[PDB]
Design a protein around this ligand. Structure first.
Ligand SMILES: [Zn+2]
Ligand SMILES: [Zn+2]
Ligand SMILES: [Zn+2]
Ligand SMILES: [Zn+2]
Lengths: 89, 89
């Protein structure tokens, strides 16, 4: 995209990217799946253990293998920082 | 950390987290290594091909295996968004 965006809209977009789509809260110990999507470790583990018959990604439906999941620590750092951001608009 | 931070300081901290430590520019097609650190794909590939005798992480020095690297697409999305943020302070 090549359009200017309202400051508040950009902050909100950034914030949506740091929210887990399973719990709709801030990522906590996010795992990244083979497709590149991220979920709280607890959220994706419970989804797979409890709701899903194969280990697929809830967002894109691609078949991930459990053993290919990896921690995504940069997301923890970004969550910590942005929660401290004063929203001046 | 449990201290309030200046808005501008928080934006700058967030921005440092979205910069590749090898090139000091915005992440472009970042790969995440087994240790959880991220670098532009081109940057870490050139580092390993050209400067380094084993595939270690330039930040933490841990021995990563090349085949365990993964794309970290969330970082591309965050780079795109934050570059559009008007800096009002
Ligand atoms: Zn979650
Ligand atoms: Zn996915
Ligand atoms: Zn780079
Ligand atoms: Zn590292």
């Amino acid at each position: 995209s090549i359009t200017h965006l309202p400051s508040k809209v950009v902050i909100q977009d950034i914030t949506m990217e740091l929210h887990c789509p399973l719990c709709n809260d801030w990522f906590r110990d996010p795992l990244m799946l083979s497709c590149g999507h991220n979920f709280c470790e607890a959220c994706i583990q419970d989804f797979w253990r409890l709701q899903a018959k194969e280990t697929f990604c809830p967002e894109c439906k691609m078949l991930c293998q459990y053993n290919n999941c990896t921690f995504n620590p940069v997301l923890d750092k970004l969550v910590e920082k942005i929660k401290k951001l004063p929203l001046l608009k």
